[PDB]
Ligand binder design. Structure first.
Ligand SMILES: NC(=O)c1ccc[n+]([C@@H]2O[C@H](COP(=O)([O-])OP(=O)(O)OC[C@H]3O[C@@H](n4cnc5c(N)ncnc54)[C@H](OP(=O)(O)O)[C@@H]3O)[C@@H](O)[C@H]2O)c1
Ligand SMILES: NC(=O)c1ccc[n+]([C@@H]2O[C@H](COP(=O)([O-])OP(=O)(O)OC[C@H]3O[C@@H](n4cnc5c(N)ncnc54)[C@H](OP(=O)(O)O)[C@@H]3O)[C@@H](O)[C@H]2O)c1
Ligand SMILES: [Zn+2]
Ligand SMILES: [Zn+2]
Ligand SMILES: [Zn+2]
Ligand SMILES: [Zn+2]
Lengths: 359, 359
């Protein structure tokens, strides 16, 4: 049973089937190994991936499932061989908790592209046990997967950077879209989306937000500093912005038309997909052939870059626009997320509200 | 009318509607300008694009339509300003006959990606008249679009290189798939596909052919030098070749599964689409995200590279494997091409059979 699997008792909220209903769940975590860092969870951002997972949208879900991979907390214990962290330090854990550490990808700081990468939740750890996420009281992870939180970085506002942040920061850098002056488009002004605008602006790029929500126009332009706001619903407005973007970061969580997006790209432009739709997208061959355009994918980021990303965010005072919620509000929050009703990221105040939900 | 539009009478075969039925057609071409090169058409390869066009598969077809853009012939007249071409020289014309010549793309020898590029047929020329292709008695084109044919290359066997050849040569070079030690896959062993294998091997790469025709195995391995032949519908064979390719050149002219192709690619692999299916392809976001893979498109090539391509082909004794046909066999040939019944490129013997079809 989950409660007896490991020596240290743990408590959190989990889903038991694809209805995705979350409720109190008792389990356990391994003892602190020599290279392990144990910490009390203070905050955990809510990623749409969490929603996809509890609902089994991708079909890769095993239950019971404890989601959450934008975890921030305070160190309570460290193994005898830990070097970069001390008890009391503020740390975080993203989407990864392990990898093989013996392949070219891992050697090149790309644990995220390791064929044996281990996800923070819904995966199998090196000890053969299921991984449980951040919607819980405490966490333990190997030092290589521990992110050191900057002193000038709010614990709640910076939590989403652990997944949303690195996921958009990584491709902007890798695909050479972080050049000042370049025109970058962001599709879907949601969790990853609004954070992507912030990073793009910090890199000095001109940003165009492509959205299905006219109500987000003022916030996109006046608060996030987007240079242009396009409603994908408006074919008229889209055509007027034809061939204006050097690259696009698409964060849409559902199947959506790609044709219009390629139209916004300049010759040789790049469309980067980071959203994880449940089903395949439509790709018009002509959209790529005419202008030698590219469509690529990107997943989170390696551990080294994740730390570099949070260090950059702290220097540029970048944080997510969050709505802090109590643990018992999780099911309502999940429905609001499904209905595009959050501006722009939910963050669970685990440290102050989880304990009270114990039956 | 086509016959009165220009001063020089011309004769060829054209389609009048989406049925694609080809028959004798009288038209005309402009007088030889100061920078123009006029030549008698000796051969014209039959590209599947010709088939797509006459059947109006893409919807951009204007009728009457004279296809053909793998044109080879002998110069009969040259303008006073022509610098490198002389009467009697063997020359060729590919998919392009013009561009703006005042933009960045043109300046970078990429007339093919110029927004005002002018296709050899079914386009509008600088004088506002419709362009007619190589299924005709003679051709006239500005010197910048004239390819100088190498002395050691057959006029018929080399004709297909003008479109099929440059189209596969360009991406191999551009996406860095032209190096020994690289394992490349070619999807669809047809007109473009078989020439692609030849160039790939000439570059020194290891080549895997992915086909739906098992009868093509022997020719692929024995004649073209492919190192591996995979039947795309054989899941077991495809599975065993998982993650072995650095890149893939997809020439398929119809909708086909991309998921299996992504499976063959190594991490960070590139899938290059050159085939032009009318309907959209299915693109699973996870196929790109898991491994940071790319799908790109490529169209023919610029004039500078087209000349470099044919020179490279001549140096390596590369030619298309053709079936020479008489002009009056065109409708039967189009039916066979539609049914994937040619090994591997039809080439019209215009110089010896076109005139005979004049009533
Ligand atoms: N690959 C990776 O590494 C990675 C990492 C984290 C998350 N993801 C994935 O990225 C996606 C977004 O996550 P979030 O956490 O950013 O989600 P979110 O907060 O729900 O934001 C998605 C944003 O997209 C738009 N959208 C939703 N449904 C749409 C539809 N049917 N058509 C067009 N636009 C639609 C909305 O923006 P508008 O109101 O502006 O239209 C919505 O605000 C999820 O699929 C998630 O699993 C991938
Ligand atoms: N973008 C550009 O610059 C450019 C330039 C020239 C041509 N093209 C386009 O490239 C495509 C190929 O032209 P070709 O002239 O090379 O054509 P082709 O000679 O007909 O060859 C297409 C080859 O693909 C495969 N194929 C056909 N139907 C298929 C199906 N339903 N499923 C899977 N494979 C299929 C067959 O190979 P197997 O027998 O091995 O399966 C066929 O031999 C056309 O769409 C053409 O318009 C693009
Ligand atoms: Zn996430
Ligand atoms: Zn590894
Ligand atoms: Zn062609
Ligand atoms: Zn131009």
């Amino acid at each position: 049973s989950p409660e007896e699997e490991h020596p240290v008792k743990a408590f959190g909220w989990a889903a038991r089937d694809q209805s995705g209903h979350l409720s109190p769940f008792n389990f356990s975590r391994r003892a602190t190994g020599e290279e392990d860092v144990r910490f009390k969870v203070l905050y955990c951002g809510v990623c749409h991936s969490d929603l996809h997972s509890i609902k089994n949208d991708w079909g890769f879900s095993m239950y019971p499932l404890v989601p959450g991979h934008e975890i921030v907390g305070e160190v309570t214990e460290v193994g005898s061989k830990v070097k970069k962290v001390n008890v009391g330090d503020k740390v975080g854990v993203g989407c990864l908790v392990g990898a093989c550490h013996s392949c070219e990808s891992c050697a090149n700081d790309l644990e995220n592209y390791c064929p044996k990468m281990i996800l923070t939740y819904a995966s199998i750890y090196h000890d053969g046990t299921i991984t449980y996420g951040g919607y819980s009281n405490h966490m333990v992870a190997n030092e290589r997967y521990i992110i050191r939180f900057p002193d000038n970085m709010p614990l709640d506002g910076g939590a989403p950077l652990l997944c949303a942040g690195i996921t958009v920061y990584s491709p902007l850098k890798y695909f050479g879209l972080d050049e000042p002056g370049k025109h970058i488009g962001i599709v879907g002004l949601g969790g990853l989306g609004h954070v992507a605008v912030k990073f793009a602006k910090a890199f000095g790029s001109k940003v165009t937000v492509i959205s299905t929500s006219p109500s987000k126009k003022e916030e996109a332009l006046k608060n996030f500093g987007a240079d242009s706001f396009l409603v994908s619903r408006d074919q008229e407005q889209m055509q007027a912005a034809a061939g204006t973007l050097d690259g696009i970061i698409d964060t849409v969580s559902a199947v959506h038309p790609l044709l219009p997006l390629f139209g916004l790209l300049k010759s040789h432009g790049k469309l980067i997909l980071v959203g994880a739709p449940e089903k395949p997208l439509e790709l018009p061959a002509f959209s790529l052939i005419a202008g030698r355009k590219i469509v690529a994918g990107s997943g989170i980021g390696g551990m080294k870059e994740t730390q570099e990303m949070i260090d950059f965010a702290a220097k540029h005072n970048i944080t997510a626009d969050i709505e802090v919620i109590s643990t018992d509000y999780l099911n309502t929050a999940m429905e609001r997320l499904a209905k595009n009703d959050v501006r722009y990221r939910f963050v669970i105040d685990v440290g102050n509200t989880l304990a009270a939900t114990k039956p």
